[PDB]
Design a protein around this nucleic acid. Structure first.
Ligand code: ZN
Lengths: 207, 88, 154, 68, 267, 403, 46, 48, 228, 61
RNA sequence: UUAAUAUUUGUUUAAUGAAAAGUAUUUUAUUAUUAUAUUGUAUAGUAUUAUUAUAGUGUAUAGUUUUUUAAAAAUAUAAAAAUAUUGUUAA
């Protein structure tokens, strides 16, 4: 709709009337260049439709694991010896896992200078250049948490990461810098509570 | 004390281009006499034997990593794991 | 002493009548095939951009046309290669304040690599036919492998 | 209460929600290989989505449910 | 009641032939407007079964399936042939999404246009076999593509009986023994068959037989009684048989020609 | 004394070099030697220009050797470097001086200028220092004062290229080298040989190697049909056969003169891609096939007997390459005679040899396992090597070691 | 305080479901029955 | 008793006790580190 | 090492390597294709003078036509990064592979790590409670705040613990010493300091700690009156 | 000793798996190259039964 | 007799929202190597792991506690809403 409206409002020089010819082949002449400018702008600068995703989609992605855990906890047959042992092992070594991910993170930030701000920027831009080689070689159980576990992230931030990954790279960086400035201003303004946050705190609902 | 000199406890500034320009690192340096007379490029990384003032422990740390980043000795910050460093 | 036509081997010349007209809802549904994205087009466009930067995309197409040795199907192919460079991080789009038009700029992160590319590339009748073939990688996404056959017709 | 152990075990072990379209299975394949922020995390091997027809032994051996 | 597949994305200038289906997602049911739902554990399981089944069908050109799986497989093969006749980039992306093997996707999109250029509909063919599966007493159906010998990578092949081994190429009628398969398909089939001759595979096979004997299935021989499937002498003999070829080129007479040169020692 | 000082200096230098992490190879016209052994099996972990690992993960005080570095060295065919056999006193002085110069050059200014995790080669017949096609930097031992200037003028782009080539070649995974060896196995299956490998390809060009691989894959059918028609499939060669191709092959009587191929007494088949054809290599294989397997069996028996002799007698054994090349297959009988003599007089050998170690009260660099090198005649060096000929007698060896 | 006998011959005599074990495993699947094959030994080896 | 059932000798088949084609599957797939040797540790330490 | 009578032809290390089950015509076709593609890639990387190209030249059409076969799939995409292949950002993977790392190009780290280790040394310094707290506040307001340098989570936890202990002991000391237009938040000795440090930590995006928020909650609790 | 042996074996296993993955990728690329050459020889364009005219029209893509 | 019955229905499959061990049995076979008394062997299964003698340069193609199929009724699943009802809080 918007493209049709603006392209019909553009009425500088329709002498050649070869819009279809220029759409199926090269241009007609260099003088009538307004249509060419508009076409190239709407083809490159204008973003692809439907690239932005909602946080409801990212929540529904993990809704599968949520439903699986709920069904298991509701209709779970008492586990056997090996399952009991695995559960006890995990419950006992959860603290060791937290300690070792903290040690990996502090070693990284002290020997390479990759601070949590840089780690969050890498998370949003979906770039692995901010991390050394051993980061991807870390154990898979902690490879995903050692990178983006310390810094705070929301479902909205994950959806924004997906939106960035879908959008082009220059637009990635520009929108990410804009959103980073916005988040810093939000952190500066977060001294007080808004009415919605007060209502949520009184109700007990956790976003 | 040497530890309180780097911070502003108690305008003009100059550039330090060698180990001799920094009087703090020159004291802890246990550099070998025959290898280098103190004309070590402070920006380049080179391994020299140090000797801390507190624990008096000898170790090997880079000159560029010692000045630019203020690396602490392994015994005073918890890597050598000596009785002075052990918790028990 | 001419260099005319970097066309495709299989594609024939199409005849569109003069009174042809698209519907208001059919003209915005045209899907073009993905043009070549290869090292040859990317390096040709990088060299043209290193010669002329920053410059409007129309000026870039005019410079590519003026260049004798050109490996490009059409302005659509140039737009696709520009999209690839934009996604890879070679070119960015900045909007001027006086003209309110966008402009391609070489990324200062990759300027040295662009210089090395143009140096390694720089260190009579011609006709180049482009031939493509689709395939799918191990991940399960479609992509076209391309090649160029050159010949001197007199 | 009458809930069959085997059937409830299968239902709670594996998924039931069916795909809706090929574009949707493509979007799911895109959004599946995503890192866990604070979850447990699972091994994403370099051949998880690649064709296992040559990897797994039983993907080519004679089968009765598929009839050779 | 409503199918969200009707919500069209990236609409083309011309309306689709189906315009309401996926068409690969079949929406299995029991009313005549839908496909016969073969018994599964969930609709997702049914879709996975259909996906693997159509993938294997495209791979080996035939599939013997029991129960209501045959009509579903036939209709899905018809839809795949329709996608191949379309030959659009979006159609290929959809088929690569739906299938397990992108190599089989490419094989289909390469061979099916020339194969079914001269056909309108009902491309596959289902034949109910009189022999039923022993474990279930369920009828079996042989589903294969019709145009086998006119244009396809498979041509002049015999399906009346299986080969000597399940990793050997299928039988070929003596009338058309001279034809050769495409090189990429041949190399892929060889890489697939090569895994059945390793020692680790036989180790895993004996372990699986031990697990079966422990579970209690009958007539399964002991792992210490099973035999290897392809020995070194059989491999050498079959390689000699396949490599024997005196066409268009003969050997160089090294003893008769002056190829030899002055070397260091030896005689 | 002075030799011992040179040896300890060289050991300190190579240890500091392996702590820095670079891979040092001395390339000669005949064969290359790996001097510095860094953590090659360790996967690259950091991209920083300066890495210092004082620990030695490959060699330990308990194991003293790793079962994987042997495979890594065999897969390239590199010989073991040793200062006591390097050569004359002036030559070993030059070598240890070059080692100390390189160590000091790294130590004074190590960093982005001279990056770590790089392969350095030392060549004698090299006009000027240049970068090889593989990615390793080769330097002429004659241009000693030019090493600093060359390494400091080498740009960061070429440094990064060399680092990348050394990381994906001969280090850790090495996928390019792995695919090259895979294609080598592919052509070796056609040749019905155990392993076909390229030698001298460390500091040389890769174009001839790639052309050889592609040409063999092109003309694979010719060799297969030829071996099928002439029954060239030998079980012993297929079980253990060694083919070694090089860019050039030099003669044993005249290094300037070049030969088409080379047949050794041990069974290896040496070819040069310069004057090799699908007919020439085929004719050589057909002429030497009924002889190479016999030579391999006899050499295997001799090497097993020598291994038993090294297990019993403390002395170590080696063979002279010059004499091995000059024998041209006749070395087998001489080696068998030497083995027979040693086996007949084995019981007294260790009893007489322990007396020397017991009577040498003070030595600059003593070793319990003194080296014996099978040669044509008697020789002697100030090292712990014997240079024992093939024709031996007990009293003769006694008087040759000590009156 | 109970014993488990998987498959034992009934009151009238051993059936095929137990003779299969007798010929494959070597004895009845319970182990409480001692393998006694004197008759077939006399019929074949003697 | 699977060994006595299959690998052992019977009046119908020969003994497979020493038979590589019947015993090779007994080896483990995933290799395991060697067990600690107390005699070797004693001869190595040589307590004083 | 092979006691078995039979032997297995292929090994686990080689599957699809020898290609024994391939027709010789297909074998030579694959070899010719690989050679043509390698020659085309080599010419593309280093253009020869005059373009001889005898291996990739074709004379079937009757005219001099040379097919420069462009390479494809040179970049490697693992299955863990299938999302980039499905989106279409293969150039992004190319850049992330051929681009220098960010920690090698960051120069503010040389200063931030130095200041962090100096803060750790100051914490380890054995000084009295109030004097050490004042010194830490001075050093912080002098060096970190005017440059928004990243502070480590454990250092923040330790300094807030010290500030809480100092606030408690100074409240006790003021009570013992006792034995207008002043805001309620000013009664606590380090309430505003803790607040500013916690907000700076939130802005610099360092993970807070349960002990951190516990000490801040106690500093909020030990307050005279109710404040919005 | 146990931990050292475990590390030494796991390093080899990891490198073997990585080499297997890389070799499989290279083999699939070789397969695509061979099928492209064969399609060039046989004159089969995998763009449907229509041909090159619809592609030149590039309406549907 | 109940009984043409009730509950079950398992041979690589839709492979799994996942993968680093110890201990006690059953079963045994010509392993190699360091190379000085005796003593108990390996894989494979089975049962168990709170009450510290199992957690690290980075984890076995791991799928029997995972189970077949061309109908309605009964029953189970409200994680089976694109319903409804009630109650709580908030504008
Ligand atoms: Zn100290």
């Amino acid at each position: 709709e918007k493209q049709r409206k603006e392209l019909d409002k553009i009425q500088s020089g329709y002498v050649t009337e070869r819009e279809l010819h220029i759409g199926c082949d090269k241009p007609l002449g260099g003088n009538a260049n307004e249509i060419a400018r508009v076409i190239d702008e709407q083809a490159l600068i204008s973003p692809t439709p439907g690239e932005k995703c909602s946080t409801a989609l990212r929540e529904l992605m993990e809704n599968e694991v949520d439903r699986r855990n709920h069904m298991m906890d509701k209709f779970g047959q008492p586990v056997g010896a090996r399952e009991f042992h695995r559960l006890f092992k995990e419950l006992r070594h959860a603290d060791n896992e937290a300690e070792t991910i903290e040690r990996h993170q502090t070693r990284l930030v002290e020997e390479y200078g990759v601070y949590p701000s840089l780690r969050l920027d890498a998370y949003m831009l979906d770039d692995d250049t901010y991390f050394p080689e051993w980061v991807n070689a870390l154990p898979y159980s902690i490879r995903d948490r050692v990178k983006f576990g310390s810094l705070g992230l929301t479902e909205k931030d994950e959806a924004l990461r997906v939106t960035l990954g879908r959008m082009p790279l220059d637009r990635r960086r520009r929108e990410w810098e804009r959103l980073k400035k916005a988040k810093e201003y939000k952190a500066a303004k977060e001294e007080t509570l808004t009415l919605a946050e007060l209502r949520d705190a009184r109700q007990g609902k956790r976003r | 004390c040497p530890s309180c000199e780097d911070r502003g406890l108690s305008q003009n500034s100059e550039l330090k281009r060698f180990l001799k320009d920094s009087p703090l690192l020159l004291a802890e340096a246990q550099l070998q006499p025959h290898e280098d007379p103190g004309t070590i490029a402070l920006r380049s990384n080179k391994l020299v034997c140090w000797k801390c003032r507190r624990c008096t422990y000898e170790f090997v740390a880079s000159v560029a990593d010692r000045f630019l980043r203020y690396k602490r000795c392994p015994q005073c910050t918890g890597e050598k794991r000596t009785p002075l460093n052990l918790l028990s | 002493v001419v260099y005319r036509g970097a066309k495709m081997k299989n594609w024939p010349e199409q005849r569109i009548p003069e009174n042809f007209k698209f519907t208001e809802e059919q003209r915005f549904r045209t899907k073009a095939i993905p043009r070549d994205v290869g090292t040859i087009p990317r390096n040709f466009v990088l060299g043209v951009l290193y010669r002329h930067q920053p410059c409007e995309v129309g000026g870039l197409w005019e410079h590519c046309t003026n260049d004798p040795e050109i490996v490009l199907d059409s302005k659509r192919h140039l737009r696709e290669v520009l999209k690839q460079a934009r996604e890879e991080g070679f070119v960015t789009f900045e909007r001027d304040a006086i003209s309110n038009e966008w402009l391609c700029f070489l990324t200062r992160e990759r300027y040295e690599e662009v210089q090395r590319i143009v140096t390694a590339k720089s260190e009579r009748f011609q006709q180049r036919e482009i031939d493509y073939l689709p395939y799918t990688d191990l991940n399960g996404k479609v992509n076209f492998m391309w090649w160029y056959e050159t010949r001197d017709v007199q | 209460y009458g809930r069959r152990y085997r059937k409830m075990e299968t239902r709670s072990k594996r998924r039931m929600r069916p795909y809706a379209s090929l574009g949707e299975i493509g979007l799911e394949n895109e959004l599946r290989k995503e890192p866990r922020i604070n979850a447990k995390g699972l091994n994403n091997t370099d051949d998880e989505d690649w064709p296992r027809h040559t990897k797994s032994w039983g993907d080519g051996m004679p089968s009765m449910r598929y009839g050779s | 009641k409503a199918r969200y597949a009707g919500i069209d994305d990236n609409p083309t200038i011309t309306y689709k032939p189906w315009d309401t289906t996926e068409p690969l997602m079949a929406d299995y049911g029991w009313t005549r407007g839908k496909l016969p739902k073969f018994r599964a554990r969930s609709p997702f399981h049914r879709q996975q079964i259909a996906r693997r089944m159509v993938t294997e069908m495209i791979r080996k050109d035939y599939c013997i399936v029991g129960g209501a799986r045959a009509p579903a497989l036939r209709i899905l093969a018809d839809h795949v042939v329709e996608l191949a006749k379309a030959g659009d980039t979006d159609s290929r992306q959809q088929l690569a999404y739906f299938l397990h093997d992108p190599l089989m996707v490419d094989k289909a999109f390469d061979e099916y246009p020339r194969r079914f250029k001269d056909m309108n509909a009902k491309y596959a063919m289902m034949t109910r076999l009189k022999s039923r599966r022993r474990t279930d007493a369920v009828a079996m159906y042989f589903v294969e593509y019709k145009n086998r010998d006119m244009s396809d990578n498979h041509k002049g092949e015999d399906y009346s009986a299986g080969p000597e081994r399940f990793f050997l190429p299928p039988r070929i009628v003596e009338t058309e023994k001279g034809i050769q398969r495409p090189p990429h398909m041949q190399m892929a089939f060889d890489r697939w068959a090569s895994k059945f001759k390793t020692e680790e595979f036989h180790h895993w096979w004996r372990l699986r037989h031990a697990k079966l004997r422990y579970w209690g299935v009958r007539n399964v021989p002991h792992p210490s009684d099973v035999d290897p499937l392809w020995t070194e002498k059989e491999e050498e003999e079959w390689h000699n048989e396949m490599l024997a070829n005196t066409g268009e080129y003969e050997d160089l007479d090294l003893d008769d020609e002056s190829y030899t040169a002055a070397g260091e020692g030896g005689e | 004394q002075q030799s011992g000082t040179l040896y300890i200096r060289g050991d300190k230098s190579i240890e500091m070099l392996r702590r820095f992490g670079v891979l040092l190879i001395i390339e000669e016209e005949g064969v290359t030697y790996l001097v510095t052994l860094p953590d090659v099996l360790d996967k690259p972990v950091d991209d920083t220009p300066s890495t210092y690992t004082p620990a030695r993960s490959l060699i330990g005080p308990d194991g003293e050797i790793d079962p994987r570095v042997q495979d890594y060295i065999r897969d390239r065919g590199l010989r073991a470097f040793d200062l006591r056999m390097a050569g004359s006193h002036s030559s070993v002085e030059r070598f240890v001086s070059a080692f100390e110069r390189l160590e000091r050059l790294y130590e004074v200014h190590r960093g982005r200028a001279m990056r770590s995790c790089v392969c350095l080669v030392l060549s004698i017949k090299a006009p000027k220092c240049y970068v090889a096609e593989d990615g390793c930097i080769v330097l002429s031992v004659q241009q000693m004062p030019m090493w600093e200037e060359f390494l400091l003028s080498l740009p960061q782009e070429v440094w990064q290229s060399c680092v990348q080539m050394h990381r994906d070649w001969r280090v850790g995974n090495a996928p390019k080298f792995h695919e090259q060896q895979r294609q080598l196995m592919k052509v070796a299956d056609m040749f019905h040989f155990f392993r076909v490998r390229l030698d001298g390809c460390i500091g040389s060009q890769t174009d001839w190697q790639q052309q050889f691989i592609l040409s063999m894959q092109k003309e694979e059918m010719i060799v297969r049909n030829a071996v099928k028609k002439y029954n060239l499939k030998s079980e012993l060669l297929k079980r253990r056969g060694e083919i070694c191709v090089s860019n050039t092959l030099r003669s044993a009587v005249d290094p300037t003169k070049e030969i088409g191929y080379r047949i050794g007494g041990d069974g290896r088949v040496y070819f040069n891609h310069s004057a090799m054809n699908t007919g020439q290599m085929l004719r050589a294989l057909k002429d030497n096939l009924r002889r190479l397997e016999t030579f391999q069996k006899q050499h295997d028996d001799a090497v097993a007997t020598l291994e038993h002799m090294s297990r019993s007698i403390p002395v170590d054994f080696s063979v002279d390459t010059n004499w091995k090349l000059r024998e041209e297959g006749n070395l087998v009988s001489c080696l068998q005679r030497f083995v027979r003599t040693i086996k007949a007089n084995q019981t007294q050998l260790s009893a007489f040899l322990t007396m020397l170690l017991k009577k040498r009260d003070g030595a600059g660099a003593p070793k319990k396992r003194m080296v014996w090198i099978i040669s044509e005649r008697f020789d002697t060096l100030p090292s712990g090597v014997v240079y024992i000929p093939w024709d031996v007698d007990f009293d003769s060896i006694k008087k040759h070691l000590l009156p | 305080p109970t014993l488990y006998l998987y498959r034992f011959p009934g009151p009238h005599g051993p059936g095929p479901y137990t003779m299969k074990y007798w010929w494959t495993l070597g004895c009845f699947p319970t182990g409480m029955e001692v393998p006694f094959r004197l008759h077939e030994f006399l019929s074949t080896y003697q | 008793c699977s060994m006595r059932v299959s690998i052992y000798s019977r009046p119908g088949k020969v003994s497979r006790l020493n038979n590589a084609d019947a015993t090779w599957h007994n080896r483990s797939r995933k290799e395991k580190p060697p067990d600690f040797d107390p005699s070797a540790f004693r001869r190595r330490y040589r307590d004083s | 090492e092979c006691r078995t009578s039979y032997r297995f032809a292929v090994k686990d290390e080689e599957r699809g390597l020898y290609d024994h089950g391939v027709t010789p015509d297909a074998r030579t076709l694959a070899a010719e294709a690989e050679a043509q593609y390698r020659a085309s890639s080599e010419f593309l990387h280093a253009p020869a003078g005059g373009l001889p190209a005898p291996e990739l030249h074709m004379e079937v059409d009757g005219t001099s036509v040379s097919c420069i076969a462009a390479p494809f799939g040179e970049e490697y995409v693992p299955s863990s990064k299938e999302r980039f292949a499905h989106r279409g950002h293969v150039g992004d993977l190319s850049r992330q592979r051929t681009s220098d790392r960010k920690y090698l190009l960051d120069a503010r780290s040389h200063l931030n790590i130095r200041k962090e280790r100096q803060l750790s040394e100051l914490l380890s310094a054995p000084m009295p409670l109030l004097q050490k707290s004042n010194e830490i506040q001075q050093m912080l307001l002098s060096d970190f705040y005017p440059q928004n340098l990243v502070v480590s989570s454990r250092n923040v936890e330790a300094v807030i613990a010290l500030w809480a202990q100092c606030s408690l002991e100074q409240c006790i000391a003021g009570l013992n010493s006792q034995r207008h237009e002043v805001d309620a938040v000013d009664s606590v000795p380090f309430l505003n300091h803790m607040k500013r440090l916690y907000f700076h930590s939130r802005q610099t995006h360092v993970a807070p700690t349960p002990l951190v928020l516990e000490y801040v909650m106690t500093a909020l609790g030990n307050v005279t009156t109710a404040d919005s | 000793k146990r931990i050292d042996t475990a590390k030494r074996m796991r390093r080899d296993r990891r490198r073997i798996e990585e080499l297997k993955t890389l070799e499989f990728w290279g083999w699939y690329m070789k397969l695509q190259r061979v099928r492209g050459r064969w399609c060039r020889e046989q004159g089969v364009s995998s763009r449907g039964v229509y041909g090159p005219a619809v592609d030149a029209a590039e309406l549907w893509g």
